[PDB]
């Protein structure tokens, strides 16, 4: 009973950051070094943990969240950051215990959107799919797009010849929870 890390990493379609996908991982074994020793990721920073000890640890549940994002925006997928992605799309908690994995995705991904308008910053692990027209004044917008009345999601214009900073990157955030419950994900 190996863990389906394949089904998330090697997947054909990734989701827009604003509507990121979450895979819950449970009742399985997990070689965390088929991932660390690959030389196929450009970003792989771990916060509450160290990858070497990951095959010597058990966790109640593991969550794998995935989406696409610009290269210059992978920096926001860390605890304590601000910016349009961290604020309105995907927020990591200050007290985060997990791993953030990204790789360059230009060959497969060059549609994807992100949320540009929200009145307040997102809470950690909040997911806002709302496509309500955004109210930037005191006048109601009524599904009508116009002055003070903006569509909340705009498109990444992913275009293969842009510099690495504006090229699509695929990201997987591994969240590791320990609860007072029978562990089900054991590295070995």
């Amino acid at each position, epitope marked *: 009973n190996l863990c389906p890390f394949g089904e998330v990493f090697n997947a054909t379609r990734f989701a827009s950051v604003y509507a990121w996908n979450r895979k819950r991982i449970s009742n399985c074994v997990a070689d965390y070094s088929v991932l660390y020793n690959s030389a196929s990721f450009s970003t792989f920073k771990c916060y509450g943990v160290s990858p070497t000890k990951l095959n010597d640890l058990c966790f109640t549940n593991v969550y794998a969240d995935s989406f696409v994002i*610009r290269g*210059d925006e992978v920096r926001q997928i860390a605890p304590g950051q*601000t*910016g*349009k992605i961290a*604020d*309105y799309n995907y927020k990591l908690p200050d007290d985060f215990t997990g791993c953030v994995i990204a790789w360059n995705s230009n060959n497969l991904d060059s549609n994807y959107l992100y949320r*540009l*308008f*929200r*009145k*307040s*910053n997102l809470k950690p692990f909040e997911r806002d799919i709302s496509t309500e027209i955004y*109210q*930037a*004044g*005191s006048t109601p917008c009524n599904g009508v797009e116009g*002055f*003070n009345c*903006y*569509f909340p999601l*705009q*498109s990444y*214009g992913f*275009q293969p*010849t*842009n*510099g690495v*900073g*504006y090229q699509p990157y695929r990201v997987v955030v591994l969240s590791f929870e320990l609860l007072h419950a029978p562990a089900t994900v054991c590295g070995h």
Partner: antibody, heavy 116, light 109 residues
Framework: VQLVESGGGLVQPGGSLRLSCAAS????????MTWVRQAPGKGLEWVSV???????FYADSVKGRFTISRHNSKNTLFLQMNSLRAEDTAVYYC???????????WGQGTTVTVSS | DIQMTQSPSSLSASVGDRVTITCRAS??????LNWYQQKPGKAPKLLIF???SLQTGAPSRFSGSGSGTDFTLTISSLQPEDFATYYC??????????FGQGTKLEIKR
């Protein structure tokens, strides 16, 4: 639908100054509010922006000395200009950035002169 | 990091002309380009957003066109009130803002 700026003047290098911008046809706390300056005979350079959710960002020539901020009570946008240098001499504008839809409400412009 | 290049720094033209200003970008920014007018001593007005949409209150003779890295602001018959400086703005990666350096319209003579 207007932005009314204020608070420019003469100060001397190393001094301090506080610019204010009052808003009529929208809610400043619901919007991206940007500060833009223009030196004599040059173009528009960015200075500061506040995000609707609170996050603030700054032009590299300015970090650690200016502070963008706002009081919801009054739709008023503020810029706190500390440790001024002659560099900073220019006309300052507030503007509402509707991003895709463009920067559509601009201030009159207030003039900031730094000289000894 | 996305640099804007307005291409004629100065364009001299006559009342009645079809004047075409251009703008140029460092990256394909799709159609996230805005266009502005500024008369001397005054603040900027937004003319065209989203490369081709006309701002409300902008006159009909103003039109935008472009996608990718090359864009155009076109005035179909120049009126006297249009001698000014036109700036372009990108809105593709906007927390660092960049504007073009300007195109000034003089009177041909």
């Amino acid at each position: 639908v207007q932005l009314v700026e204020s608070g420019g003047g003469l100060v001397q290098p190393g001094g301090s100054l506080r610019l204010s911008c009052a808003a009529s046809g929208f809610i400043v706390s619901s919007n991206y509010m940007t500060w833009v300056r223009q030196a004599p005979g040059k173009g528009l350079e960015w200075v500061s922006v506040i995000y609707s959710g609170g996050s603030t960002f700054y032009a590299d020539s300015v970090k650690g000395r200016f502070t963008i901020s706002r009081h919801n009570s009054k739709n008023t946008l503020f810029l706190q200009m500390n440790s001024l240098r002659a560099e900073d001499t220019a006309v300052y504008y507030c503007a509402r950035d509707a991003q895709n839809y463009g920067m559509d409400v601009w201030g009159q412009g207030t003039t900031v002169t730094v000289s000894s | 990091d996305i640099q804007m290049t307005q291409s004629p720094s100065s364009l001299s033209a006559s009342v009645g002309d079809r004047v075409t200003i251009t703008c140029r970008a460092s990256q394909s920014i799709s159609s996230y380009l805005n266009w502005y007018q500024q008369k001397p001593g005054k603040a900027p007005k937004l003319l065209i957003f989203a490369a081709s949409s006309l701002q409300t209150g902008a006159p009909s003779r103003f039109s935008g066109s472009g996608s990718g890295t090359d864009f155009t602001l076109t005035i179909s018959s120049l009126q006297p009130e249009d001698f000014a400086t036109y700036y372009c703005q990108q809105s593709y990666s906007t927390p660092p803002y960049t504007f073009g350096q300007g195109t000034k319209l003089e009177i041909k003579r």
